[PDB]
Amino acid sequence: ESPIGVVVSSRRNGPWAELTLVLTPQELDQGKRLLLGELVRVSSGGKDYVGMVLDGYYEPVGRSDPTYTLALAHINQVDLEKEDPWARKEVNFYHHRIVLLGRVVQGGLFAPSTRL
Amino acid sequence: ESPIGVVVSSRRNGPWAELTLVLTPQELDQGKRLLLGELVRVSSGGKDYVGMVLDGYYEPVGRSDPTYTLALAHINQVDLEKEDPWARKEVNFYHHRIVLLGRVVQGGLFAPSTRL
Amino acid sequence: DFLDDLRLDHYQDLLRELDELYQKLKQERQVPLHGDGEAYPLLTLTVDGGEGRAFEELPLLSFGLVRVAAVGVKGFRLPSIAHLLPGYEVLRDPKGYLEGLLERSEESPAADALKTFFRATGISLEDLGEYYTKDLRAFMGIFRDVLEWAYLVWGVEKVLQESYKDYLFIKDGRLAQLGVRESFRSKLQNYFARKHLLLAGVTKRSRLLAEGLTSLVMARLFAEARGTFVLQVPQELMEKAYRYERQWNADLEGAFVMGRRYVARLLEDTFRPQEGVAIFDLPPYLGEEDAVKVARSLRAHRSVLYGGSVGTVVEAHGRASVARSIPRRMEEEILARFRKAFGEDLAKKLTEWLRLAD
Amino acid sequence: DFLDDLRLDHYQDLLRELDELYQKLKQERQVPLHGDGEAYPLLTLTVDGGEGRAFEELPLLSFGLVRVAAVGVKGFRLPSIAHLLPGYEVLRDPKGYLEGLLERSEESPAADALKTFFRATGISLEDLGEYYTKDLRAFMGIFRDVLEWAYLVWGVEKVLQESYKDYLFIKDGRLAQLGVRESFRSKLQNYFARKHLLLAGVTKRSRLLAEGLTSLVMARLFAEARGTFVLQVPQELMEKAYRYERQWNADLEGAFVMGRRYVARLLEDTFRPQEGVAIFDLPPYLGEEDAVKVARSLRAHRSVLYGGSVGTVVEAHGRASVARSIPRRMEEEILARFRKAFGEDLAKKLTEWLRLAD
User: Which of B10, B19, C5, D12 has its CA 20 to 30 A from that of D26?
Assistant: First the structure.
């Protein structure tokens, strides 16, 4: 019943509204993932929308160097599962893109896309 | 029976999902290399994937200027191997890209690509 | 005249000491840092963010940036102190404001810690010297120090009580204190010795030229060495640096560590000559076995973030360095209080001049 | 933690004072920079990089970055001086190093300039005091000043001789010197009065550390005013500024200008409040008529490059601040002389000392 991640950006890409979601290190360790093409609920302004997952990628969050940190933790036999919680807590982020297909209103009517 | 390198990034590039890994100076000195078109095994979440080495390139790792360092090493003679061991350890990184083809599940069934 | 006429004098002799000083380090025994042994839980002390943007970006009035906190294990952290730092008008009598808080009938959480530190070890205002009364930024130079010292003493005698037998204390900085007047550190040494405390303040990376010629020799010992070890710095390296910082560093009257200095390497492979090293100092009443057990405790908490830091040190920074955009946040709040207070139109005049310059 | 009752006592007094400082500034008449008049030719003195890259990134030995030069009209510039400056080892006894250069039988042009300065006004080593003996940084603090002071005298009595009567001398920075006894200031002051030298310490430096609460009133007049004007700041503002700056920054004993401070405006439209302003000092033996003529000379050479600078100041900076990447040039050249000198292979070890770290 809790939200999946955190929304950090939104825009309109052509005829479709889209938003970017970020999964944090605390959520990923519990096994929370988003499949591609999966249907999710988007809550905004007290109103519910149907969204679909399109893209997923990895991007650094904040001012950090994931490559150097991971290489240094690799040349040493450092098991990031449980040896170094602090290093794992700044590099375990993931980004997803979600389109807003529309919404359900009245008694099952589908309002397509959105103007808001 | 050991990982070849360290995985530093992942994303979806079109209809396929690929990842980027780095070979460190320590492993490159042992002759560990990857061939283009080679088939490798990928372990993630307890599951095994078939990967194919697609591309390889060079990119600076950390705060360093490989061109300046190599140029000044060459200008002043300097046999970098037996004279400046620490100069190679900051420039001897290589990057490889691996696409995920699918998984082998059940008793020989092939599951193509991945949504995860 | 373009760089010509170098006329360099004898510098081979300068390298002669460097050669023989390295031989002394090689003579010193190295205790291997194996993974098996006993270790102490950590309680890292950190203030951070106190200096901030100095005054040229701060409003210069009610410049509240002092914020000292601590962290423990995975949630054993103590409540943070975020002392309200007043304006310059009340600081025109540097002794006046401190007495107004120490002698105040009601004690703030910051005032309680300062009061607690005063009667725990008998610290009097005559022991603080005159550096805090020298100038304005000089007052904040050692106000943070006593606040940092108070945060350690207050937690021991008020928050933790008797259980200080299984918690290693880590201080982010050098043990040595400046502006002592030979009494601030005398009362600190015997107070710690009587309680047999385990205060081992680490500096991890130190600085490029925080020391004199010792930083050069220390740098090359680490790179040519292999694996993990514990090394006690011989007094000869320390003796040279202590007398030098007067003629190279700032007004550093009082720089020798209150005890002994130990260095260690936390990572076998580093990609760089000086990565993975940790420098920490111990009180004089701690021996080799105490130092080895302390070094093993740091290795169990080691991390790979900047250069192989101590881990709990950087975690404590995130809990005590909440400054970010202080000048924008405080300026809007300051005008909010001045608008809702008396006048109700003097604030409009105040904005007219702040927006003009500075 | 958070705000937590930041508390206030009284701030109505601060702007009550600030209101009447601005009114006092309006009392004096704003003498405008009239388009017509007479102006002297200028001769600008610059050092621009005496400290430069300090010592941290420099090889720390033979860190000679002093480069004092000058410019006249467009091409009347005098030869520059690149005075030699050995490393920390040779000047380990700072008093001894100067004596070996002052009392040497053969004096370099850089040494002759310092020697002529000492002989012209009778400045002894006791007049310098004891600040440069405290630290290597402190040694460089006043060496850049005396070299600039000597270079000014070096051109008066050797290159100009009789011609020190139709040129206005512009010196970067304030007409003040810190770190020396009152004898240095008193002897220098009366020496200029005897020769009636024209001099102006143009600063234009809108720093917030120096010139504190005074700047919060200076900015009000500059922005509200119109056109080009020259104003004599009342001594009351300097009395506030001179005394207060002792209690904010480091050992700034001695900040009063040797005379009176004048502010001026070089541009009418500026896009910003503090753009186009210029602050210059004058010796006490020059009146308002001389002050007006000095401002006309500065305006006749004005430029729009950074904030409406003086033009000849920035022009001489390009001719006298040729540092760029000094450390790369110094390390390779110093090591070049090491090989041709004794050893020819100890430099290989010397590189190993530096290659690993610093």
Answer: D12
